[PDB]
RNA sequence: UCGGAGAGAGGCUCGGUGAAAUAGACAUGUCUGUGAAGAUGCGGACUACCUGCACCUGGACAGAAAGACCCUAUGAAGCU
RNA sequence: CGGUAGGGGAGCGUUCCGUGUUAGGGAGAAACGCGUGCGUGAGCCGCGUUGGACGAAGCGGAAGCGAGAAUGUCGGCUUG
RNA sequence: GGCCAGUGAGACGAUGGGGGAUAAGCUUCAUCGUCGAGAGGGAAACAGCCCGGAUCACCAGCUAAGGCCCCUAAAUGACC
RNA sequence: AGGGUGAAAAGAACCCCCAUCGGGGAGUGAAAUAGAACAUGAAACCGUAAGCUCUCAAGCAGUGGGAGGGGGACCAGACC
């Protein structure tokens, strides 16, 4: 903002200071293929008989993964199951239940989500204002016509965590109800399925 | 609510109101120049208009008015002697308020007023 | 230290008023400079500034008697408020039930620095950048090493600690 | 300062505490380097040691070794400070080239080792309570511990490969 | 009525500077007053 | 002979002051509530000691299952424990799990030796 | 109407979990066989 | 029925003076369950940016008076 | 070697007396404020830009001797 | 036997019955278990139910009752 | 109910603010940061400044984990 001798000093100052701090300090590794130890960190702390907590460093926003999930005759509690070890990051080594470790993903053809039994007239999805008569029932196939998206939505909600970072965990979480998406200069891949009970 | 209701209440009743203004006047009028608050200022304008409005047509039914409004008896019959050559030419606006810093006692909006 | 030279204490012992009510103005003069309270303080709807008025005028008029500085250069750093000696007393109410009020006391502090007391200094120090300055004060000795650091220069740049880091202005 | 001494109030000046000539900074000769090599040093080479590392049992807990590295462990019956102590079992050796994989152990590996210190562990209050009964207990507990350095690691190179391609 | 409890320190300040607050609005126009004084040009308050 | 209280009271205090520094609120200041959460501290303490074992053990079940679904399908933990004990190894959960963070290379192999 | 809720402590004994099978309840800890004789954990060299 | 308008004193705003009952500490939501059987405080789900002002009082088994109704005491007192 | 009522055993600390006109003490006592020290703990041992004249330890002795609660209680200060 | 305490309001559950309406988280006895005086784990929360009786430490391991889709640790394991 | 300036009032000439009160220098004194409402001066309570930090939250307020940032006469894989 403001252009001063005074001023700019104070800004040459903390770059010095982050530079005589960035230098005594250890280089921060990354974790693919990473020997056990090396010449720099061996004269630090004990990272070795002391559990493993992540850095800011490691969960870097930016560079996270991007998946794809063709909900086109996906069953929905079996498909909303998987997406929340991917996104919790259960999946990898470096699980940690207070940091988002995880992944995005993107779900596609939403409308197109299978479903067993009757479920589709049976299943009601609700909610409530406050009123003693704010109470709204809904089907299946009724919030299938009026907004697709938060079937996918209400169902990986109840399987995130709850609190601070469950509310932070399901931005993570993009859902579309055509064949496309707009998120494609991630470069995401397709999803991989354990199971074999989702594909009717 | 007061929709429509064009009237200065100044906390008073109307014995007061119809007492408080009508004293103001007698004190202008002899002084020219006096201190008081803003919306006794502001509610002042429409009844010295009045009054100066009846020097212009300076008739016996016209001054009987002053004498039941104006208190004392000297000023009416001085205020119609000067008017028409002072205020021979001009149609309305016959005064102007000078605002002012308050009091110590109670932060009361204070502002002169006198005669153009 | 720079506080024992630059600045200069004033209170007001056992002005008969509130705490909190004087706080509405003590709080708006501090970082305002003198020319700029006078002012406001002249002006206020508030009954707090007369006593304070006083007060400004008067720690001022000890600066240029007892330091000589000039009013142009003056900026309030600090001004406290503190509590005093509450006097008491007994009032009756309905039903024989007597209730007690107060008569509340402060202990206004009041400071007043000057800018322009190490510009020599200051403006000097900031003009060189951070790794200019190490060769500087690397070839001086100590006696000179000392006294280039006692002003502010340190506490406005965010260096007072790091510099001990670098075996510089050691104790 | 000097003259600070004959006013103590009069305002402080920039030729007074040094000549107004400053010769030069001389910013490009190594007397300009070497001053900032005094109160800005380099990190430099950190200290060699051998690229290696094992896994070992004391007690009845695990832990990872790493040469030139000191670790707490349990306390050990004698072991006098300043002891030349060996440590038997390991589970496992690993290096860039190659890891080898304790079969239960692995045989006729060892681990050299010193005894830095015979100390004891901070203090962890044990305390117990149970409400609306008046019991209240405050203990202390100072656990016995040593402090291990280790050296080097030997006898390990004829056990077979396990190696990654 | 009657408090349940009493409050505590800091939602007392919170309540305080709120009505210490006041006193920034009201030295802004007392400096509005006085830049718009010291220049002998407004016909429309006298000051003495 | 007359015994004031004197400062035993105080000193006392001091120490069950000092142990309440970065409490919030009154359970800073106020002597008879930083003596009934002293007692709550410690308790939580002593029984977070005991709740601190099985919780490293709970997160490194995890980060070990979650390193080693990858490598075959069908598999999982159950399956890699019963298999150590097997070959008879001895390696506990606490190397295991921070191998897999930071020498992942090693359970390849180890996953080889096994099978 | 002439039916009880079963509220207190009866609603333990009535909904605490149980097994109620062969399969599952006559299963045991795993068996593997005994390790070698292994060799001590510390040794001291003359020093 | 069926309220409506108006005046005055308060209420509301500004300045000055300036209390009180009360108060385990309080970072003080709803639903439905649970529980000494009627929960802001435990469980689950839902809802909810932070902080004020003016208004209304359902709850905090609100405040106020160691229940004055009932019972107990080998209690007290008046009367027959 | 869980433990309420409750019983036993071993100890800490306060003020004062004996040794004692003790040691020490304006080269800073008591106190107050502190601590990467020690103890099962009550507490001990130490430190000081405070303080300005008293006073341990050890072997023993005596009590107006250890407070978080009694709609306690005196004084001081908050909340509203 | 000596010295010297507290207790003499019990609670739910199992069984054996009585009273009641083969009602009561009812009431009264007899024989056991637990809570009372008992933490921990399972039972969503939940003194009396199930496992099991906390001397202390360990970022070691094996198990009990009971469980292994996600929240939430363990086979989205196999076969009829 | 209300006790304690100091060895000695030497109780602050004089100058500035200045209607007083009161304050800042000067001078007195071992000490004035002992300046009269004055001795050591704990806590609640009211505050100023500095370092980290909260406006998608939820909670008897801590505890075990400890991201990012900060700090210092011992050192620093430590400590706050
Ligand atoms: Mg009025
Ligand atoms: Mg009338
Ligand atoms: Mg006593
Ligand atoms: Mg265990
Ligand atoms: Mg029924
Ligand atoms: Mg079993
Ligand atoms: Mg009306
Ligand atoms: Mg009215
Ligand atoms: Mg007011
Ligand atoms: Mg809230
Ligand atoms: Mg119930
Ligand atoms: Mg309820
Ligand atoms: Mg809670
Ligand atoms: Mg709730
Ligand atoms: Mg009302
Ligand atoms: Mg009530
Ligand atoms: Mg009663
Ligand atoms: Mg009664
Ligand atoms: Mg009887
Ligand atoms: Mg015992
Ligand atoms: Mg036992
Ligand atoms: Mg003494
Ligand atoms: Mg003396
Ligand atoms: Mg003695
Ligand atoms: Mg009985
Ligand atoms: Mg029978
Ligand atoms: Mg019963
Ligand atoms: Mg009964
Ligand atoms: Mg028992
Ligand atoms: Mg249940
Ligand atoms: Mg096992
Ligand atoms: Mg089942
Ligand atoms: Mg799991
Ligand atoms: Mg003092
Ligand atoms: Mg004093
Ligand atoms: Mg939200
Ligand atoms: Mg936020």
Same mark, same amino acid.
């Given at each position: 903002?403001?252009?001063?001798?005074?001023?700019?000093?104070?800004?040459?100052?903390?770059?010095?200071?982050?530079?005589?701090?960035?230098?005594?300090?250890?280089?921060?590794?990354?974790?693919?293929?990473?020997?056990?130890?090396?010449?720099?960190? %061996?004269?630090?702390?004990?990272?070795?008989?002391?559990?493993?907590?992540?850095?800011?460093?490691?969960?870097?926003?930016?560079?996270?993964?991007?998946?794809?999930?063709?909900?086109?005759?996906?069953?929905?509690?079996?498909?909303?199951?998987?997406? %929340?070890?991917?996104?919790?990051?259960?999946?990898?080594?470096?699980?940690?239940?207070?940091?988002?470790?995880?992944?995005?993903?993107?779900?596609?053809?939403?409308?197109?989500?299978?479903?067993?039994?009757?479920?589709?007239?049976?299943?009601?999805?609700?909610?409530?204002?406050?009123?003693?008569?704010?109470?709204?029932?809904?089907?299946?196939?009724?919030?299938?016509?009026?907004?697709?998206?938060?079937?996918?939505?209400?169902?990986?909600?109840?399987?995130?965590?709850?609190?601070?970072?469950?509310?932070?965990?399901?931005?993570?979480?993009?859902?579309?109800?055509?064949?496309?998406?707009?998120?494609? %200069?991630?470069?995401?891949?397709?999803?991989?399925?354990?199971?074999?009970?989702?594909?009717? | 609510?007061?929709?429509?209701?064009?009237?200065?209440?100044?906390?008073?009743?109307?014995?007061?109101?119809?007492?408080?203004?009508?004293?103001?006047?007698?004190?202008?009028?002899?002084?020219?120049?006096?201190?008081?608050?803003?919306?006794?200022?502001?509610?002042?304008?429409?009844?010295?208009?009045?009054?100066?409005?009846?020097?212009?047509?300076?008739?016996?039914?016209?001054?009987?008015?002053?004498?039941?409004?104006?208190?004392?008896?000297?000023?009416?019959?001085?205020?119609?002697?000067?008017?028409?050559?002072?205020?021979?030419?001009?149609?309305?606006?016959?005064?102007?308020?000078?605002?002012?810093?308050?009091?110590?006692?109670?932060?009361?909006?204070?502002?002169?007023?006198?005669?153009? | 230290?720079?506080?024992? @030279?630059?600045?200069?204490?004033?209170?007001?012992?056992?002005?008969?008023?509130?705490?909190?009510?004087?706080?509405?103005?003590?709080?708006?003069?501090?970082?305002?400079?003198?020319?700029?309270?006078?002012?406001?303080?002249?002006?206020?709807?508030?009954?707090?500034?007369?006593?304070?008025?006083?007060?400004?005028?008067?720690?001022?008029?000890?600066?240029?008697?007892?330091?000589?500085?000039?009013?142009?250069?003056?900026?309030?750093?600090?001004?406290?408020?503190?509590?005093?000696?509450?006097?008491?007393?007994?009032?009756?109410?309905?039903?024989?039930?007597?209730?007690?009020?107060?008569?509340?006391? @402060?202990?206004?502090?009041?400071?007043?620095?000057?800018?322009?007391?190490?510009?020599?200094?200051?403006?000097?120090?900031?003009?060189?950048?951070?790794?200019?300055?190490?060769?500087?004060?690397?070839?001086?000795?100590?006696?000179?090493?000392?006294?280039?650091?006692?002003?502010?220069?340190?506490?406005?740049?965010?260096?007072?600690?790091?510099?001990?880091?670098?075996?510089?202005?050691?104790? | 300062?000097?003259?600070?001494?004959?006013?103590?109030?009069?305002?402080?000046?920039?030729?007074?505490?040094?000549?107004?000539?400053?010769?030069?900074?001389?910013? &490009?000769?190594?007397?300009?380097?070497?001053?900032?090599?005094?109160?800005?040093?380099?990190?430099? $080479?950190?200290?060699?040691?051998?690229?290696?590392?094992?896994?070992?049992?004391? &007690?009845?807990?695990?832990?990872?070794?790493?040469?030139?590295?000191?670790?707490?462990?349990?306390?050990?019956? &004698?072991?006098?400070?300043?002891?030349?102590?060996?440590?038997?079992?390991?589970?496992?050796?690993?290096?860039?080239?190659?890891?080898?994989?304790?079969?239960?152990?692995?045989?006729?590996?060892?681990?050299?080792?010193?005894?830095?210190?015979?100390?004891?562990?901070?203090?962890?209050?044990?305390?117990?309570?149970?409400?609306?009964?008046?019991?209240?207990?405050?203990? &202390?507990?100072?656990?016995?511990?040593?402090?291990?350095?280790?050296?080097?690691?030997?006898?390990?190179?004829?056990? $077979?490969?396990?190696?990654?391609? | 009525? =009657?408090?349940?409890?009493?409050?505590?320190?800091?939602?007392?300040?919170?309540?305080?500077?709120?009505?210490?607050?006041?006193?920034?609005?009201?030295?802004?126009?007392?400096?509005?007053?006085?830049?718009?004084?010291?220049?002998?040009?407004?016909?429309?308050?006298? =000051?003495? | 002979?007359?015994?004031?209280?004197?400062?035993?009271?105080?000193?006392?205090?001091?120490?069950?002051?000092?142990?309440?520094?970065?409490?919030?609120?009154?359970?800073?200041?106020?002597?008879?509530?930083?003596?009934?959460?002293?007692?709550?501290?410690?308790?939580?303490?002593?029984?977070?000691?005991?709740?601190?074992?099985?919780?490293?053990?709970?997160?490194?079940?995890?980060?070990?299952?979650?390193?080693?679904?990858?490598?075959?399908?069908?598999?999982?933990?159950?399956?890699?424990?019963?298999?150590?004990?097997?070959?008879?190894?001895?390696?506990?959960?606490?190397?295991?799990?921070?191998?897999?963070?930071?020498?992942?290379?090693?359970?390849?192999?180890?996953?080889?030796?096994?099978? | 109407?002439?039916?009880?809720?079963?509220?207190?402590?009866?609603?333990?004994?009535?909904?605490?979990?149980?097994?109620?099978?062969?399969?599952?309840?006559?299963?045991?800890?795993?068996?593997?066989?005994?390790?070698?004789?292994?060799?001590?954990?510390?040794?001291?060299?003359?020093?």
């Amino acid at each position: 903002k403001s252009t001063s001798a005074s001023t700019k000093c104070t800004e040459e100052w903390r770059q010095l200071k982050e530079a005589v701090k960035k230098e005594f300090a250890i280089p921060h590794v990354p974790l693919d293929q990473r020997w056990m130890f090396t010449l720099e960190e %061996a004269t630090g702390p004990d990272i070795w008989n002391t559990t493993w907590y992540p850095k800011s460093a490691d969960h870097v926003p930016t560079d996270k993964k991007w998946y794809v999930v063709d909900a086109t005759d996906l069953i929905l509690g079996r498909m909303a199951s998987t997406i %929340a070890i991917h996104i919790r990051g259960k999946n990898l080594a470096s699980y940690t239940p207070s940091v988002d470790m995880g992944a995005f993903v993107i779900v596609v053809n939403a409308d197109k989500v299978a479903v067993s039994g009757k479920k589709r007239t049976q299943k009601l999805y609700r909610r409530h204002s406050g009123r003693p008569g704010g109470l709204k029932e809904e089907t299946f196939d009724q919030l299938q016509k009026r907004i697709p998206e938060r079937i996918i939505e209400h169902a990986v909600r109840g399987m995130l965590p709850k609190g601070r970072l469950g509310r932070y965990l399901f931005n993570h979480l993009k859902v579309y109800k055509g064949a496309e998406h707009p998120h494609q %200069a991630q470069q995401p891949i397709d999803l991989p399925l354990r199971d074999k009970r989702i594909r009717v | 609510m007061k929709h429509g209701r064009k009237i200065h209440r100044l906390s008073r009743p109307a014995d007061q109101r119809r007492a408080l203004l009508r004293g103001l006047t007698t004190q202008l009028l002899k002084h020219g120049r006096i201190k008081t608050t803003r919306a006794k200022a502001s509610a002042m304008r429409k009844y010295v208009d009045k009054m100066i409005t009846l020097a212009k047509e300076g008739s016996l039914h016209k001054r009987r008015q002053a004498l039941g409004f104006i208190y004392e008896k000297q000023i009416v019959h001085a205020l119609f002697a000067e008017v028409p050559e002072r205020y021979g030419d001009r149609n309305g606006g016959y005064t102007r308020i000078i605002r002012t810093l308050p009091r110590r006692g109670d932060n009361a909006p204070m502002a002169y007023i006198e005669l153009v | 230290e720079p506080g024992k @030279c630059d600045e200069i204490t004033t209170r007001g012992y056992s002005i008969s008023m509130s705490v909190d009510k004087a706080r509405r103005v003590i709080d708006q003069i501090r970082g305002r400079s003198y020319a700029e309270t006078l002012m406001i303080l002249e002006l206020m709807p508030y009954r707090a500034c007369y006593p304070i008025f006083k007060l400004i005028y008067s720690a001022a008029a000890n600066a240029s008697h007892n330091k000589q500085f000039n009013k142009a250069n003056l900026i309030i750093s600090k001004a406290e408020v503190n509590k005093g000696i509450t006097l008491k007393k007994v009032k009756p109410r309905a039903r024989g039930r007597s209730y007690m009020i107060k008569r509340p006391t @402060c202990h206004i502090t009041i400071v007043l620095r000057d800018i322009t007391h190490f510009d020599s200094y200051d403006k000097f120090l900031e003009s060189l950048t951070p790794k200019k300055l190490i060769a500087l004060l690397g070839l001086m000795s100590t006696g000179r090493r000392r006294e280039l650091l006692c002003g502010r220069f340190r506490e406005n740049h965010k260096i007072k600690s790091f510099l001990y880091k670098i075996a510089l202005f050691k104790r | 300062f000097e003259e600070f001494q004959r006013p103590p109030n009069q305002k402080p000046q920039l030729s007074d505490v040094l000549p107004d000539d400053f010769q030069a900074p001389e910013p &490009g000769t190594p007397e300009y380097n070497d001053i900032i090599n005094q109160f800005l040093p380099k990190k430099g $080479p950190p200290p060699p040691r051998e690229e290696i590392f094992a896994v070992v049992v004391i &007690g009845s807990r695990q832990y990872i070794v790493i040469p030139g590295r000191w670790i707490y462990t349990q306390r050990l019956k &004698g072991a006098t400070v300043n002891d030349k102590i060996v440590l038997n079992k390991v589970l496992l050796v690993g290096t860039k080239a190659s890891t080898y994989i304790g079969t239960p152990i692995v045989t006729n590996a060892a681990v050299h080792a010193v005894v830095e210190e015979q100390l004891l562990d901070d203090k962890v209050i044990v305390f117990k309570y149970k409400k609306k009964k008046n019991y209240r207990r405050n203990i &202390g507990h100072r656990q016995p511990i040593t402090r291990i350095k280790i050296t080097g690691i030997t006898g390990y190179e004829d056990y $077979p490969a396990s190696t990654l391609e | 009525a =009657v408090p349940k409890k009493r409050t505590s320190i800091y939602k007392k300040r919170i309540r305080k500077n709120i009505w210490k607050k006041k006193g920034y609005w009201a030295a802004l126009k007392a400096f509005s007053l006085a830049k718009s004084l010291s220049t002998g040009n407004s016909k429309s308050f006298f =000051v003495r | 002979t007359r015994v004031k209280r004197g400062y035993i009271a105080r000193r006392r205090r001091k120490k069950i002051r000092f142990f309440a520094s970065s409490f919030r609120g009154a359970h800073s200041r106020l002597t008879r509530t930083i003596a009934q959460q002293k007692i709550r501290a410690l308790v939580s303490a002593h029984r977070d000691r005991d709740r601190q074992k099985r919780d490293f053990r709970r997160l490194w079940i995890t980060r070990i299952n979650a390193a080693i679904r990858e490598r075959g399908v069908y598999y999982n933990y159950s399956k890699f424990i019963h298999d150590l004990y097997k070959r008879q190894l001895l390696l506990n959960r606490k190397i295991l799990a921070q191998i897999a963070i930071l020498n992942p290379n090693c359970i390849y192999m180890i996953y080889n030796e096994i099978i | 109407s002439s039916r009880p809720q079963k509220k207190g402590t009866a609603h333990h004994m009535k909904t605490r979990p149980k097994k109620t099978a062969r399969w599952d309840i006559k299963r045991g800890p795993a068996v593997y066989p005994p390790l070698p004789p292994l060799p001590a954990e510390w040794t001291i060299v003359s020093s």
